């Protein structure tokens, strides 16, 4: 029978960090549907609105088996006298499970499926794909801010914000004879590099190298949380006009955004949790990014002509944060696709701006390091807001859930009978 598991949510977090806003434990065989409707607000910013932030709300299903593996299987089999499922440990702070959208129990411990569940959802859909998994054991092992506000999500695809995989080959040797090459061996050489290149660029995931075989893999083959629903939108608001002697001609942008998310009814195969997370981000607009062709001094035929034959046939080009940013070290490199500068265009911000707080732009220079300079650098948004004890953004939503089960009943459980 319909079980109304509705509840209110009073949220808040940083800019480019994934954070759990709601979770509902589900049992095997029940149908789950939710209607999440609220408003998203940003902290008051220092001037008028200039650029809308984009918001992504995700609802996933992670069965317990996925989390406890064989331990869970045995638990279900063993039944009533199964050994209790050991929760996970947390860090000394009421805001020490935040990322799990839950208050750490009185003993500072929490469900592993809440932890691993979360871990599994990031390492499978947010973490850059050449990147290493968050193999955190317990929330007491994750960085303070990773578990306060959540781990950093990736910046919105730019030219410099989506470099080619760093382990990307720029050459490939075939050991040849001293005065002869094997015309047939060469052929083969190319076949192998192909298979390698594909794995590097597109199939870094099993489920991915499979799909290109024309097959399919159940979220049960690779233990990946199942993405049930996804909502995306741009949050906006209005400016407030100051009207006293001193702040007459001054404004403060107020971002109030009504949003809604609908998770269509869903059949829960096994017992598990449904995680609903939010992520607020701004387009990667840096105040000092230059057009590659304008930042790289001598222009050769290969750079300026856009000869099809050329672009379509040479290795990825290794560039530095220096051919894209005005002061940046010659030393911080990344691999780009030849002619990439012709498939795109950076946003452009006049110098008059780079000295102004209140603009949701990237002031600072990138981060020499690949990873870090891709997964967004949240902190470079601290200067955009006024005062804030409600982080960068806060949310007030009413999670209207409806679960259809085969439950006892309230009176038949308390009725020894």
């Amino acid at each position: 029978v319909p079980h109304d598991l509705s509840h209110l949510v009073f949220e808040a977090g940083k800019i480019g960090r994934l954070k759990t806003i709601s979770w509902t434990p589900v049992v095997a065989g029940d149908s789950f549907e939710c209607d999440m409707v609220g408003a998203i607000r940003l902290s008051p910013l220092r001037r008028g609105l200039a650029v809308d932030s984009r918001v992504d709300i995700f609802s996933f299903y992670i069965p317990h088996r996925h989390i406890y593996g064989q331990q869970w299987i045995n638990f279900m089999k063993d039944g009533v006298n199964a050994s209790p499922l050991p929760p996970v440990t947390c860090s000394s702070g009421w805001d020490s499970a935040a990322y799990l959208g839950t208050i750490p129990s009185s003993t500072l411990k929490v469900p592993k499926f809440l932890h691993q569940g979360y871990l599994n959802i990031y390492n499978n859909y947010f973490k850059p794909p050449w990147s290493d998994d968050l193999t955190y054991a317990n929330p007491s092992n994750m960085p303070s801010e990773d578990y306060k506000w959540g781990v950093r999500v990736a910046n919105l695809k730019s030219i410099w914000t989506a470099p080619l995989p760093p382990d990307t080959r720029t050459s490939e040797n075939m050991t040849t004879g001293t005065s002869t090459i094997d015309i047939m061996g060469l052929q083969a050489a190319y076949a192998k590099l192909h298979t390698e290149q594909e794995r590097d660029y597109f199939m870094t995931r099993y489920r991915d190298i499979m799909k290109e075989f024309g097959g399919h893999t159940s979220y049960d083959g690779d233990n990946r949380p199942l993405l049930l629903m996804r909502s995306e939108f741009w949050a906006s608001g209005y400016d407030v006009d100051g009207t006293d002697q001193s702040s007459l001609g001054q404004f403060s942008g107020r971002v109030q955004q009504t949003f809604n998310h609908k998770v269509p009814r869903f059949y829960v195969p096994e017992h598990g949790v449904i995680m609903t997370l939010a992520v607020t981000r701004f387009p990667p607009t840096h105040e000092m990014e230059m057009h590659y062709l304008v930042g790289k001094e001598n222009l050769t035929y290969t750079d300026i002509a856009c000869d099809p034959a050329l672009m379509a046939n040479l290795p990825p080009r290794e560039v530095s944060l220096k051919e894209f940013f005005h002061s940046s070290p010659d030393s911080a490199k990344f691999k780009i696709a030849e002619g990439q500068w012709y498939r795109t265009q950076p946003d452009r911000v006049a110098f008059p701006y780079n000295a102004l707080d209140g603009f949701p732009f990237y002031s600072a220079l990138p981060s020499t390091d690949l990873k870090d300079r891709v997964l967004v650098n949240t902190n470079n948004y601290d200067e955009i807001f006024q005062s804030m004890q409600l982080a960068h953004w806060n949310m007030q939503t009413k999670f209207n859930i409806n679960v259809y089960r085969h439950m006892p009943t309230t009176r038949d459980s308390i009725m020894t009978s």
Partner: peptide, 12 residues
């Protein structure tokens, strides 16, 4: 138009 960004899969 056609794809551009290639990380080695899907990045949200």
């Amino acid at each position: 138009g056609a794809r551009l960004w290639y990380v080695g899969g899907t990045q949200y």
